[model samples]
Target: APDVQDCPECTLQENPFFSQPGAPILQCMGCCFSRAYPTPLRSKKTMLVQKNVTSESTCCVAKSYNRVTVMGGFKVENHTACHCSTCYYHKS
Candidate 1:
């Protein structure tokens, strides 16, 4: 049997949201088409402007915007699955 590892801090944790500093939580509504960078750009923004993505007319309807958050320069919740017209033609 494999040994089970446990932490002493698990007994009485102070905060429920205990995680690494680099990890970031994001709430994405549409296609996650955003990018992250180490430093801000000329506009003084950490994240770059997301590109437009069109959803499947049959599977998913309408268009949506990209939304995400970054912390400690960690890349999380990356969505590379594209369902636009260009992607459909390139599949074959």
Candidate 2:
């Protein structure tokens, strides 16, 4: 957890995500977080889809179009998106 005095600038104080590893160091001093490592894999998923529907009373009409589903990863720890633009399975 970041000491309030250590990072007065830090918006998030008493970070539940981080904790001091060594002895209690004075605020604004050298202190490492207990758990500092790369974020684990994220399973959460979100999607943006466009759907179209056509209906007629007098005339009967029907249509079928392709559907696109995009999958991605977001680094919740850093509050940022994953660096992968192209899918790993995709090949040029």
Q: Which prediction has the highest TM-score against the true structure?
A: 1
Candidate 2 structure quality by residue, lDDT tens digits, 40-77: 23333422231211110111111111112112531113
Model 1 CA deviation exceeding 4 Å by range: 1-20, 31-77, 80-87, 90-92
TM-score for each candidate, following the candidate numbering: 0.17, 0.14
Candidate 1 residues 15-56, lDDT tens each? 113233752333222332333334423322324445332211
lDDT of each: 0.28, 0.22
RMSD to native for every prediction?
16.9, 22.9
In model 1, the worst 10-residue window by lDDT is: 7-16
Against the hidden true structure, what lDDT does model 1 obtain? 0.28
